[PDB]
Amino acid sequence: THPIIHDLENRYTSKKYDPSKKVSQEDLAVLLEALRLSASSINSQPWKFIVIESDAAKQRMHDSFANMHQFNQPHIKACSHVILFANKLSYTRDDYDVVLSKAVADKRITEEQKEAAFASFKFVELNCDENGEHKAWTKPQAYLALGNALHTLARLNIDSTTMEGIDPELLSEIFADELKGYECHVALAIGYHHPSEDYNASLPKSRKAFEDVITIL
Amino acid sequence: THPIIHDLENRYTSKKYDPSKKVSQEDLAVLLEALRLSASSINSQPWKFIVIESDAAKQRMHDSFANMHQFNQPHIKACSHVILFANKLSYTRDDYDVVLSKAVADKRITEEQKEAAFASFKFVELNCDENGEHKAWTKPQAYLALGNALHTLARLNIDSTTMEGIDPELLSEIFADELKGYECHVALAIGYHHPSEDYNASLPKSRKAFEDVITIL
Ligand SMILES: Cc1cc2nc3c(=O)[nH]c(=O)nc-3n(C[C@H](O)[C@H](O)[C@H](O)COP(=O)(O)O)c2cc1C
Numbered sequence: 058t059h060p061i062i063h064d065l066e067n068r069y070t071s072k073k074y075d076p077s078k079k080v081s082q083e084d085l086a087v088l089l090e091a092l093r094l095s096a097s098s099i100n101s102q103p104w105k106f107i108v109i110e111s112d113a114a115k116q117r118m119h120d121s122f123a124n125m126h127q128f129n130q131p132h133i134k135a136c137s138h139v140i141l142f143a144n145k146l147s148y149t150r151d152d153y154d155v156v157l158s159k160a161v162a163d164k165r166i167t168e169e170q171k172e173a174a175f176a177s178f179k180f181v182e183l184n185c186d187e188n189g190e191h192k193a194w195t196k197p198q199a200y201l202a203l204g205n206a207l208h209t210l211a212r213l214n215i216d217s218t219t220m221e222g223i224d225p226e227l228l229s230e231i232f233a234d235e236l237k238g239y240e241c242h243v244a245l246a247i248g249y250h251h252p253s254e255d256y257n258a259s260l261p262k263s264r265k266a267f268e269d270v271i272t273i274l
Numbered sequence: 275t276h277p278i279i280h281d282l283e284n285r286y287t288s289k290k291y292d293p294s295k296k297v298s299q300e301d302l303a304v305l306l307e308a309l310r311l312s313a314s315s316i317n318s319q320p321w322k323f324i325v326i327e328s329d330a331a332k333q334r335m336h337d338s339f340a341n342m343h344q345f346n347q348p349h350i351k352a353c354s355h356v357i358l359f360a361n362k363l364s365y366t367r368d369d370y371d372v373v374l375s376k377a378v379a380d381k382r383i384t385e386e387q388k389e390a391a392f393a394s395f396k397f398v399e400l401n402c403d404e405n406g407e408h409k410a411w412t413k414p415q416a417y418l419a420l421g422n423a424l425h426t427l428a429r430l431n432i433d434s435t436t437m438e439g440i441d442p443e444l445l446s447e448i449f450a451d452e453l454k455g456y457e458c459h460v461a462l463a464i465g466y467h468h469p470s471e472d473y474n475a476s477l478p479k480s481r482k483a484f485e486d487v488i489t490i491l
């Protein structure tokens with residue numbers, strides 16, 4: 058099988074973790090750098106990836122399922138790490154300056170060009186909310202990073218469970234300081250599936266017919 | 275360098291294509307199958323990938339820049355193929371029926387189990403607009419597929435240019451029948467970069483400091 062196809066046909070959404078297996082620090086470092094290298098519109102990188110690693114942090118994450126989507130709750134303590142994909146509520150010229158200043162330091166643009174680079178900020182203004190927020194534009198950028206992570210995990214042979222069945226309001230309460238100025242609509246559990254109890258590990262993957270999703274013109 | 279990191283450090287946004295080079299049909303088939311295999315919330319797959327391959331289709335795509343974002347226009351005819359990432363405007367039971375029906379055909383689930391499997395639809399209703407549209411939920415799913423595509427292209431060593439600088443309204447007119455019931459906010463040109471005029475090929479990649487985007491708890 059073609060290496061790319063094999064990876065994508067074999068990755069799947071785990072429904073049960075093995076609590077005695079952890080992701081190595083070597084593999085976690087590759088995953089985190091892969092997230093950091095994700096592309097985004099105008100290199101805005103309007104995101105924050107919060108890694109739930111310690112037992113203390115796992116408890117806080119476990120508690121965020123207090124009143125909602127409790128089918129996802131068992132994974133928190135059983136998996137190795139949980140990663141929260143947060144997207145920025147409002148993206149400002151100051152936030153963009155952080156990006157452009159780093160670009161000047163990394164040698165891709167010069168100081169005079171920096172002011173010239175501020176024209177791309179047009180894209181941010183084109184995506185302003187009725188309330189002055191940009192979440193409808195920043196959230197999709199975080200999902201791009203998520204697509205990148207799922208492909209990355211398939212290559213490392215690490216199991217995972219993407220989760221939209223989370224409580225954004227409660228997470229904003231529990232991780233008050235960390236999520237300040239951001240919102241989180243999706244999380245990702247990673248680890249190793251249970252050798253016998255993960256029923257999804259043996260089910261066939263199902264997707265729509267090629268002609269139903271692809272059109273060649 | 276670690277294979278995953280090398281791929282992600284070496285992929286970049288091409289700013290000029292070599293018009294004499296095309297993506298092979300074998301590579302294109304891998305890319306399209308990779309898109310089809312993308313994960314999505316509840317396996318909704320609320321997308322359509324429109325591939326602009328023919329000269330006739332390239333002309334139509336070229337014409338969609340008549341009013342705005344002309345800086346992206348030169349790539350259309352110069353690149354090999356352009357792929358439109360379309361997300362569904364409103365997701366219904368009928369739509370989910372196509373997913374569940376294919377699931378049974380794939381032997382992932384049974385006919386009787388199909389009706390029980392319909393209980394995941396809570397997520398769709400959960401994301402329903404006051405206008406009965408789910409575009410704020412479907413668009414992020416398409417961006418996940420895009421993140422998957424960018425990683426896939428890095429592995430195939432094919433150059434690309436993601437584009438949000440497009441005209442969704444004009445695209446809806448030009449590709450009237452193909453985009454009916456969908457909207458398109460992002461496109462992707464693929465091909466091979468110009469050997470000496472793609473300035474971005476020799477510029478360093480720049481991303482925020484690890485500490486600025488990642489928090490370990
Ligand atoms: C954005 C998103 C949210 C999802 N949320 C959940 C969730 O809350 N819990 C869970 O068990 N699965 C969830 N999934 C898993 C999907 O059901 C799964 O990706 C889809 O059925 C395709 O199957 P595969 O992932 O096994 O290929 C989610 C996937 C995505 C990409």
Ligand SMILES: Cc1cc2nc3c(=O)[nH]c(=O)nc-3n(C[C@H](O)[C@H](O)[C@H](O)COP(=O)(O)O)c2cc1C
Nearest residue numbers: 096097098099100285286287346436437438439479
């Ligand atoms: C959603 C999205 C939209 C983008 N739109 C454009 C575009 O319209 N034109 C273009 O030249 N570059 C565009 N880019 C390219 C980004 O500027 C680029 O991904 C970002 O600067 C990081 O650089 P790299 O892609 O070179 O790593 C876009 C990227 C993304 C992911």
